[PDB]
Design a protein around this ligand. Structure first.
Ligand SMILES: [Mg+2]
Ligand SMILES: [Mg+2]
Ligand SMILES: [Mg+2]
Ligand SMILES: [Mg+2]
Ligand SMILES: [Mg+2]
Ligand SMILES: [Mg+2]
Ligand SMILES: [Mg+2]
Ligand SMILES: [Mg+2]
Ligand SMILES: [Mg+2]
Ligand SMILES: [Mg+2]
Ligand SMILES: [Mg+2]
Ligand SMILES: [Mg+2]
Ligand SMILES: [Mg+2]
Ligand SMILES: [Mg+2]
Ligand SMILES: [Mg+2]
Lengths: 67, 160, 184, 142, 258
RNA sequence: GCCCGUCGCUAGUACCGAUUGAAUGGCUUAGUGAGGCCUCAGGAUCUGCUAGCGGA
RNA sequence: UUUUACUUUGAAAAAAUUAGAGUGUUCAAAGCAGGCGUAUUGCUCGAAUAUAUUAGCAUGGAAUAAUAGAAUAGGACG
RNA sequence: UAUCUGGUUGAUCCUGCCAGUAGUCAUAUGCUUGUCUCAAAGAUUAAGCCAUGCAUGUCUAAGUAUAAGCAAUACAGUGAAACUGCGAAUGGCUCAUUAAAUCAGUUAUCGUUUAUUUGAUAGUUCCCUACAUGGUAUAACUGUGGUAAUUCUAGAGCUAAUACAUGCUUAAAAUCUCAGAUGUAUUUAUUAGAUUGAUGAUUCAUAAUAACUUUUCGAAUCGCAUGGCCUUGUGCUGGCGAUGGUUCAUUCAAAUUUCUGCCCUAUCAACUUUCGAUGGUAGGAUAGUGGCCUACCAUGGUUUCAACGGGUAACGGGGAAUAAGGGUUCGAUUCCGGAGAGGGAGCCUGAGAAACGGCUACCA
């Protein structure tokens, strides 16, 4: 079996220069549980529509729906 | 729900091609203009709501007019703005009574005083000195380069 | 808008060209300035590459050069008397390159007096140094008695916002004087 | 050109000033240039009174592109001719040639005198009309 | 087509990058810079394909953002900086200096050099022009403008550039019998001596070059780079010295290793 | 033996044909002409320097 | 140092593709890889070459084919 | 990798076609289908119509932070929102248009624009702040709302800048004008630019003179370190940088552009020219050349060497299939160039779009 190998001069440089997926494979700092790509894109699209922070819209739909 | 247009002077609503620095429209893109229907400037029954500004106080105060009042949400930020606010003159070292705010959040309440801009600071004075010295240094370098090149020309012209 | 393309403007064989490539912004033309006289009004046009042009409308003053003593005084343009491309421009007093206009001549007379001291049109011996060889011409000084100097525009008011020019002299002046005493 | 000043405008070379103050000899100072590439500036260009801002010697145009040769087939325009450029085009399938030609409109300065015939040499200049991109530089009246 | 393109599809990249075909759809488009698009060599290509130091473009930019790489004395953290001919690529981590020179096949050969000669670089004088205020200047092949040049430095000459002060220390003059590198055309990467220059007013200047082995090839003046005199190159030449052996003798040299 | 054409039946394919036939698409005279752009103006109201006067 | 055609040579004619050199992808289509030794703290070969023969460019040739020379000499030579 | 065979006759030798035969990254379809590698794929007809979801956003140390946002003596970190900047003109798709048009190879810009990158480059500014000018300014935010609905916004109160608008500090050196002017940028005219730089060639680079400008630029910006000398103070100095900025050059580009080369058709032989067709002068317009447009003038320009017109189930090329040699046919489609975003047209912003996951109008 033929593969490729790296030997970092220190674990600090290992963490600094290694890909996150390979660190996760090995057992170092693990995957960040991000939402699915479709859901994150839909979410940023929904946040595109609102202009500012949103608390304005919150207090505005606090009176309406319903009266 | 259409807002009023500041100077249309009509009793109905009409469509205008709205631009950057006008009301009733916020351009979603640099250079964008949109044809939106706005309502005229002269009031009539069509208005669901009017907007009025009190400019004179005649008689007994309204219960939401003077008794209940709000503070100014933000104090001044620029150095000369704080000077113009609190009356202190130029040579008064204005970094002391900047309005602050106490945050009763976790029983530590570390005040968040705003940063002040345009403040006269030795960092800015050093930047000014660096620029005004770079200019003269560059001018002297150019002058001496030109002088030595003129020397080279007046030397290689001596061959005749 | 106006297009300077040659995709219209049928080919040299006379064939009508088929259309492709809907009008491109890099081929646009614009409206003529038609610079008039008086009460300066210049509009800034944004041109290709972020540059700026100056459309002169209603220009009142221009920088005109004598070209024989090299003065280039700033003066007032009176009117247009001749234009080789369109008599309508003379009629409408439309300021335009190569237009033959009339200028005030007062700064030129004042400079001639402060320079030669030789009573053109009605630190001591500088007038002596600028010696008797001061006779300008027999057609550029006879206009000083009327206070109107024939000049030709040289800048492009619609392009540069300025209406600079030079005073007619010599065979150019003779040519334009013949044209004027014909058409006037 | 038969009373060169025959236009509505005064015809003159730009920034070539005949000072009425200085008492020079010719009194009609005339600018010219060497067109380059070994084309001799003709004496008609040197000493004439025409203006021709499109002349390659006394005008504002430069010869900086292709140098072509052709046969003059028309001299019916003002300061413009049409030169015929015959050539042979190769048809590979038949291993043979066919005669082809292309007419080329060329600006002819008043320095030159050109008639039908008169194999001429022309040099590329900037577009000086809708169809003209060449200036006659050698008359070679063959 | 509405503006400048920002992509460089694979199979549209310059072939002398020796880029893999089925790696991806795109190649590193050389950013605007000193040399050219075609005649350049991006730092990503030279770091991931010519030295194998990095394995990906991510790792190339990782190497670059900590100020390791250095092109002509400056940091050049640009992932696709267009380094080209006569450029000095010095890296202080793994301290070594390369000079981007053309091998005889026409690729950018990896040519280690020493600091004592990587201090400077060479430049072919593209033009001599008077600047504002009547100050003469020279423009070189790498896009450098150098003021107050020697009044005897003309076009097509070569100038030795300090590369720390950016000034002309010496200049070789284009004339029959000087060592010239070929930086374009069919003979891209060859070295030889100028024999004759054909003028062709209006057209293109031609120059006849005779390499050490007396092979005589002609080429356009545009892509010949004076690099000194015969036997005294003002720079260090790569492993082949631009000889252009034919395929037969190349195979012979190859089979001489048994 | 082979064979030709009219006429008659059937089927198919084209042709001519009153209907100033019909439909669709291209180009185009003339008329009207939206819209933006340039331009002649216009001046809500928006603050500034002192009813004088400017700017947006 | 008339004007052409023609032809030789050279530069050009992107890459991919095509022909094709090398290379045991297990063979092969392919790809431009890879190879050589070890307990290293590494050494090394490559990713050639040919052709696009229309048009333009530079160059050598001067057969073939065309073209022009001095005839009312307004001819050549210093 | 140069091949034929069956069919007209009672039989023969031919002409000649029909039929066979072989290939097709050349498509469909039928039957069948165990394995590995590779991977075309709503082009053809309808550039026909589209529900829905996604496809363009972006922050460093280094523009603006009092998030009532988090977390351990003005914020020292992170940091939503927002303003500012940059990008959204690349990409990706498709082939409808398009036949001297595109495109290919080859040219030119001495005929122009060019964000960015790279390199160079700016002692000259003033007619009572520079130890730093203003809101004439506003966002986000706070509170009051309209509409059924939109990435709709009004009304009121703050708040900054590398947003906006102004505005000084640099002597010395330095010559002309009759104390002042003399940086650069714009416009004009004149002068030199030789034989004192360059080019084959210029009215080139460049400099000078006299003036001219609804003012251009000549940092009122930011980070990390803090150092040296010292009147020891709010001293004087001094780093490495970032961003910005005039001009030039460079690069990425763009736009025009030379020469030669496109399939079928004459049951298309004349075409173009009032209404620009070809040229000249002048102007306007353009970034710039140019009938690009206008005014005046001339009567030209193309064509049997095929113009002009018509057709294309035509985007061009690199290339593909087949192929003794020569060729025939194909090329919507992995790369290059072009064009378009339902059909047209117009335009904002911007260096760059006549943009369409931008706007405006009309038609469907
Ligand atoms: Mg058959
Ligand atoms: Mg379809
Ligand atoms: Mg695209
Ligand atoms: Mg000039
Ligand atoms: Mg013109
Ligand atoms: Mg085709
Ligand atoms: Mg089609
Ligand atoms: Mg195709
Ligand atoms: Mg199709
Ligand atoms: Mg494409
Ligand atoms: Mg488009
Ligand atoms: Mg559709
Ligand atoms: Mg559009
Ligand atoms: Mg879409
Ligand atoms: Mg798009």
């Amino acid at each position: 079996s033929v593969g490729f190998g790296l030997v970092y001069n220190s674990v600090a440089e290992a963490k600094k220069f290694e890909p996150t997926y390979r660190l996760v494979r090995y057992g170092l700092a693990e995957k960040v549980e991000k939402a699915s790509r479709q859901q994150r894109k839909q979410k940023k699209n929904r946040d595109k529509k609102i202009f500012g922070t949103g608390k304005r819209l919150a207090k505005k739909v606090a009176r309406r729906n319903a009266d | 729900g259409f807002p009023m247009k500041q100077g249309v002077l009509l009793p109905t609503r009409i469509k205008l091609l709205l631009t950057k620095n006008v009301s009733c429209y916020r351009p979603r893109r640099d250079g964008e203009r949109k044809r939106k229907s706005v309502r005229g400037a002269i009031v009539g029954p069509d208005l669901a709501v009017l907007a009025l500004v009190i400019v004179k106080k005649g008689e007994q105060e309204l219960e939401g007019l003077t008794d209940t009042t709000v503070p100014k949400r933000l104090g001044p930020k620029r150095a000369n703005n704080i000077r113009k606010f609190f009356g202190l003159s130029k040579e008064d070292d204005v970094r002391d009574f900047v309005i602050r705010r106490e945050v009763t959040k976790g029983e530590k309440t570390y005040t968040k005083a705003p940063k002040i801009q345009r403040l006269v600071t030795p960092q800015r004075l050093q930047r000014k000195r660096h620029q005004r010295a770079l200019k003269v240094r560059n001018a002297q370098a150019q002058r001496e380069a030109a002088a030595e090149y003129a020397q080279l020309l007046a030397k290689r012209l001596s061959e005749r | 808008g106006i297009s300077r393309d040659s995709r219209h403007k049928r080919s040299a064989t006379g064939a009508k060209r088929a259309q492709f490539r809907k009008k491109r912004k890099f081929e646009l033309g614009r409206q003529p300035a038609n610079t008039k006289i008086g009460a300066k009004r210049i509009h800034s046009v944004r041109t290709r590459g972020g540059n700026k042009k100056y459309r002169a409308l209603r220009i009142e003053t221009g920088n005109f050069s004598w070209a024989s003593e090299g003065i280039s005084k700033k003066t007032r343009i009176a009117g247009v008397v001749y234009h080789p491309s369109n008599n309508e421009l003379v009629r409408t007093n439309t300021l335009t390159k190569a237009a033959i206009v009339q200028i005030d001549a007062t700064p030129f007379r004042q400079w001639f007096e402060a320079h030669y001291g030789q009573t053109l049109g009605k630190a001591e011996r500088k007038w002596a140094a600028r010696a008797a060889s001061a006779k300008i011409e027999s057609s550029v000084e006879s206009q000083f008695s009327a206070g109107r100097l024939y000049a030709c525009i040289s800048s492009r008011p619609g392009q540069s916002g300025r209406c600079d020019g030079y005073i007619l002299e010599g065979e150019e002046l003779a040519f334009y004087l013949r044209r004027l005493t014909a058409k006037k | 050109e038969l009373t060169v000043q025959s236009e509505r405008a005064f015809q003159k070379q730009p920034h070539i000033f005949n000072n009425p103050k200085v008492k020079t000899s010719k009194r009609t100072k005339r600018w010219y240039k060497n067109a380059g590439l070994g084309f001799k500036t003709p004496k008609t260009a040197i000493e004439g009174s025409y203006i021709d801002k499109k002349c390659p010697f006394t005008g504002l145009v430069s010869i900086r592109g292709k140098i072509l040769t052709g046969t003059v087939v028309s001299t019916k325009m003002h300061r413009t001719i049409v030169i015929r450029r015959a050539y042979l085009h190769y048809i590979p399938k038949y291993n043979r040639y066919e005669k082809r030609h292309k007419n080329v409109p060329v600006h002819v300065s008043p320095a030159f005198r050109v008639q039908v015939g008169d194999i001429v040499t022309v040099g590329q200049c900037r577009p000086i009309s809708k169809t003209v991109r060449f200036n006659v530089v050698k008359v070679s009246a063959a | 087509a509405r503006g400048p393109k920002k992509h460089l599809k694979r199979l549209a990249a310059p072939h002398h990058w020796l880029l893999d075909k089925l790696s991806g759809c795109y190649a590193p488009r050389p950013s605007a810079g000193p040399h050219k698009l075609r005649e350049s060599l991006p730092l990503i290509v030279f770091l991931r394909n010519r030295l194998k130091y990095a394995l990906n473009g991510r790792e190339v930019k990782a190497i670059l953002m900590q100020r390791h790489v250095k092109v002509d004395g400056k940091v050049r953290t640009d992932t696709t900086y267009p380094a080209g001919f006569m450029d000095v690529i010095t890296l202080d981590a793994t301290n070594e200096n390369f000079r981007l020179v053309y091998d005889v096949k026409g690729r950018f050969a990896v040519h280690r050099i020493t600091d004592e000669e990587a201090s400077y670089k060479l430049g072919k004088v593209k033009k001599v022009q008077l600047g504002k205020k009547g100050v003469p200047y020279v423009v070189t092949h790498d896009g450098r403008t150098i003021r107050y040049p020697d009044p005897n430095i003309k076009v097509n000459d070569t100038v030795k550039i300090d590369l720390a002060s950016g000034k002309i220390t010496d200049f070789i003059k284009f004339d029959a019998g000087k060592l010239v590198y070929v930086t374009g055309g069919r003979n891209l990467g060859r070295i030889g001596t100028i024999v004759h220059k054909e003028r062709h007013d209006g057209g293109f200047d031609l120059v006849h070059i005779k390499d050490s082995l007396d092979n005589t090839f002609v080429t356009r003046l545009n892509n010949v780079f004076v690099i000194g005199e015969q036997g005294k190159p003002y720079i260090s030449l790569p492993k082949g010295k631009g000889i252009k052996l034919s395929i037969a003798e190349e195979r012979d040299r190859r089979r001489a290793q048994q």
